[PDB]
Structure 1
Amino acid sequence: GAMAPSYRVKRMDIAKNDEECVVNAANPRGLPGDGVCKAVYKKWPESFKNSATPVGTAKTVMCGTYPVIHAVGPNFSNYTESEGDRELAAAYREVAKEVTRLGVNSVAIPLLSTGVYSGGKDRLTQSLNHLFTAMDSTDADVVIYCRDKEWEKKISEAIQMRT
């Protein structure tokens, strides 16, 4: 575990992370995808061997010894707000199981269902709060990766609000 498990946020490409494993914002089919998923495919293409897994689940595939945790958030275009909320909570609970199983001391994690799967809504708070609910009981250092300058500020404020 980490010395003093922390949350941090960085505004940069998760494919450049400095952590012991990465969480992909995957699609259920293990396809290269777009956004975070395509960055992950370019950097760790070997990790897409038999990476297909259902919505609300996570499936780890090793790229060398580097673990890629393929987490499948719901596409809110297709799910109801209620069912999508359940599946998004579930995906992060499966990430926490994988992070624990792997024995890593740090993980790089994107905000699931906030991009193309957001159904055109701002889900920063929804996605981050489900991230915290899952990861709070883990002792890995968590580094959240985002693209937008205003999102960085809001995620940082949310982390600091808990102290």
Structure 2
Amino acid sequence: GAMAPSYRVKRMDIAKNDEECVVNAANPRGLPGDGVCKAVYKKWPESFKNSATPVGTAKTVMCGTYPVIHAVGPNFSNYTESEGDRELAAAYREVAKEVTRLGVNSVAIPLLSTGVYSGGKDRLTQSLNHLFTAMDSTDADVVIYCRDKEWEKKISEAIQMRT
């Protein structure tokens, strides 16, 4: 565990993280895909061997000794708001199980279902609150990666609010 488990947010490419493992915002088929997934495929391509896993689950594949946790959030274009919300919560619970099983002291994590799977809606709060529900009982240092300057401010505020 970390000596004083924390949440932090950084605005940069998750493929340049400084943590002991990474969560990929994966597709169910283990394909190279877009956004975070595209960077993850370029950085850790060996981790995509048998990475296919259903919506609402996480599957870990090693790149050397570095763990890549493939977490499949729902595509809100296809799911109802209700079913989508259930699957997005579930994906994060499976990430918390994997992080605990691996015994890492830190994890880099993107906000699942906020990009091309968002169904054209702002899901910062919905996705972040499911991340907190899952990860609050873990003792890993969590570092959230984002791209947008206004998202960095809102994520930083949400973390600071509960401190």
Q: Tell me the TM-score normalized by structure 1.
A: 1.00
Q: Equivalents in 1 of 2:70, 2:40: separation in Å?
A: 10
Q: Equivalents in 2 of 1:93, 1:129: separation in Å?
A: 12
Gaps of 5+ in 1: none
Percentage of pairs with the same residue: 100
Q: How many residues align?
A: 163
Q: Equivalents in 1 of 2:152, 2:132: separation in Å?
A: 16
Shift of 1:148: 0.2
1:87-139: per-residue Cα shift (whole Å, max 9, x none)?
A: 00000000000000000000000000000000000000000000000000000
Shift of 1:51: 0.0
User: SS of the residue aligned with 1:108?
Assistant: strand
Q: Equivalents in 2 of 1:42, 1:155: separation in Å?
A: 26
User: SS of the residue aligned with 1:84?
Assistant: helix
1:18-68: per-residue Cα shift (whole Å, max 9, x none)?
A: 000000000000000010000000000000000000000000000000000
User: SS of the residue aligned with 2:145?
Assistant: strand
1:68-97: per-residue Cα shift (whole Å, max 9, x none)?
A: 000000000000000000000000000000
Q: Equivalents in 2 of 1:126, 1:29: separation in Å?
A: 25
Shift of 1:160: 0.2
- Is 1:28 the counterpart of 2:28? The answer is yes
Equivalence for 2:10: 10
Q: Which runs of 4+ in 1 moved over 3 A?
A: none
The alignment yields a C-alpha RMSD, in angstroms, of: 0.2
Q: Equivalents in 2 of 1:113, 1:155: separation in Å?
A: 15
